[PDB]
Nucleic acid binder design. Structure first.
Length: 270
DNA sequence: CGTCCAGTCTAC
DNA sequence: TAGACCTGGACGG
């Protein structure tokens, strides 16, 4: 997922787990190359926050829970197919690679990190990935300053469409978001990044890096809504103006990722 | 049946 | 910088 999907996933965990109590161990699928979670508690709560393309889970034992255990933080990157689902304990979806089990009483649920392609990762510790820039959703002012104070960086030599995927500067921006952002300002995707960013040192490119992904969050859904997978999927596809849309052009960037756009490809075009 | 298509991470 | 990492759906023969 991108920033909006990670943010909605964090809201799903907080909303869905608000009145739940978990017990026992954290179970990893045997095929996951991610680390075992050394955590056991008779009674713990799960909460979440998102920063860009990362999600932090906090496992917080209730007072008197046994065995003795301090809160534990886990940080997730979702890759191409990461998600969280709350399911019945004996109806685990395929590719549920990490599970947290509700304690009794009541219906036995499992909170699952589900990842079909297994591009997703998690680490022990609550640390955000070093070198990842500030969250375009939740840390806009820090994000904007971090870009404008580092335009000398060789990252800004590249086409703007490629610079927008660089997570040191645009933490949370992925492939659909770069197409939607550039389309709203009609900025050619193969314009030089430094030229577009020097020009802004009237909502501009850095502001849309915040307000555009925020619209996706405000839509809700993306697999985390009150509405079915069909209704959430229709609402998202109705919101897209550029990415995959008929009448739009598409090219491969230098890493073979497809950029969608209208009109002028821009000067650094392959 | 087959090919193509949908974000990091690492070896050159 | 190219290839690796992986599964499932759309689609073509």
């Amino acid at each position: 997922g991108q920033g909006p999907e990670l943010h909605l996933a964090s809201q799903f965990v907080n909303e869905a787990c608000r009145a739940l109590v978990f017990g026992g161990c954290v179970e990893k699928s045997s095929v996951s190359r991610n680390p075992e979670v050394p955590f056991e508690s008779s009674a713990y709560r799960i909460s979440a926050s998102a920063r860009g393309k990362e999600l932090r889970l906090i496992l917080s034992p209730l007072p008197g829970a046994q065995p003795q255990q301090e809160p534990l933080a886990l940080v997730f990157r979702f890759g191409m197919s990461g998600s969280f689902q709350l399911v019945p304990r004996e109806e685990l979806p395929r590719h549920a690679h990490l599970r947290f089990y509700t304690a009794p009483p009541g219906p036995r649920l499992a909170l699952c990190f589900v990842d079909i392609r297994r591009f997703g990762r998690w680490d022990l510790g609550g640390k955000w990935q070093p070198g990842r820039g500030p969250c375009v959703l939740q840390e806009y002012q820090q994000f904007r300053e971090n870009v404008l104070r580092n335009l000398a960086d060789k990252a800004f030599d590249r086409p703007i469409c490629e610079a927008l995927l660089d997570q040191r500067f645009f933490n949370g921006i992925g492939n659909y978001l770069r197409a939607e952002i550039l389309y709203r300002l009609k900025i050619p995707p193969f314009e030089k990044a430094r030229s577009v960013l020097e020009a802004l040192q009237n909502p501009d490119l850095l502001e849309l890096c915040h307000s555009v992904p925020k619209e996706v969050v405000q839509l809700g859904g993306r697999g985390y809504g009150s509405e079915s997978g069909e209704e959430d999927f229709a609402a998202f596809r109705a919101w897209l103006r550029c990415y995959g849309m008929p009448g739009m052009s598409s090219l491969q960037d230098r890493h073979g990722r497809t950029i969608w756009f209208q009109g002028d490809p821009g000067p650094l075009a392959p």
